């Protein structure tokens, strides 16, 4: 018998993850952001001045040097403020935000699309449908309407 011709690599080792160090000095003034939908990113280690996220407990803001905190992201939007005062918003579908003390943010979602690519006409027709779903007595429709509303109401608030 051929002594184990096959020796497959470990797929995790291909990703150059960050080495979480304890720190010995100064604090960064801009964070290194990574935002990843399903597999493809949208931003690869971009320099950012700030980032504002939404969670279940409530909204949150992330400047550089922020403490280590891994945490949910509630379905809502996500604001990214670059160094030049500009901004960029992103509707997401849940995920996780991993913040390091080294100014290295890794946000990993299931979807991420800007506000520019969302319209109010195609949303005002979905909102009342979600509401009528929440009013139809049945678990298989009420929860679907609740979830759709959980995502839509932030967009109704932010598009205005």
């Amino acid at each position: 018998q051929d002594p184990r011709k096959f020796f497959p690599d470990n797929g995790f080792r291909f990703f150059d993850g960050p080495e979480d160090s304890f720190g010995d000095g100064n604090i960064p003034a801009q964070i290194i952001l990574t935002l990843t939908r399903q597999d493809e990113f949208i931003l690869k280690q971009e320099p950012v001045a700030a980032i504002t996220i939404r969670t279940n407990e409530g909204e949150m803001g992330v400047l550089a040097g922020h403490e280590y905190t891994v945490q949910q992201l509630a379905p809502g939007i996500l604001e990214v403020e670059y160094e030049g005062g500009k901004k960029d918003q992103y509707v997401i579908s849940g995920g996780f935000a991993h913040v390091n003390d080294t100014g290295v943010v890794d946000i990993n979602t299931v979807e991420a699309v800007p506000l520019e690519e969302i319209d109010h006409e195609k949303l005002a027709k979905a909102l009342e449908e979600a509401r009528a779903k929440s009013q139809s007595p049945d678990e298989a429709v009420r929860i679907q309407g609740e979830i759709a509303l959980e995502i839509f109401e932030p967009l109704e608030a932010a598009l205005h």
Binding site: E57, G58, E59, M60, A157
Partner: protein, 81 residues
């Protein structure tokens, strides 16, 4: 038995101190009612305006309890001989 009615004219003042020991406590009730706004406004700024009535309401009732304590402590200084 013997009977001695005495009118102490200094105890119109000691009490005015004790009541004033309870005028500063509702300050907590004020700050707790503004602090909880800031936090609630830092977690959800969209909810920054429809919470604010309850902030002022709790501040007002706490300040009103302090004002009643003070109305005693002044009613216990000037109107009594």
């Amino acid at each position: 038995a013997i009977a001695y009615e005495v009118t102490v004219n200094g105890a119109n003042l000691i009490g005015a101190g004790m009541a004033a020991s309870g005028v500063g406590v509702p300050a907590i009730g004020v700050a707790m009612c503004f602090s909880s706004y800031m936090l609630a406004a830092a977690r959800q700024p969209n909810m920054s305006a429809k919470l604010l009535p309850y902030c002022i309401l709790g501040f007002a009732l706490s300040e009103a309890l302090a004002l009643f304590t003070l109305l005693i402590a002044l009613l216990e200084l000037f109107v009594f001989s």
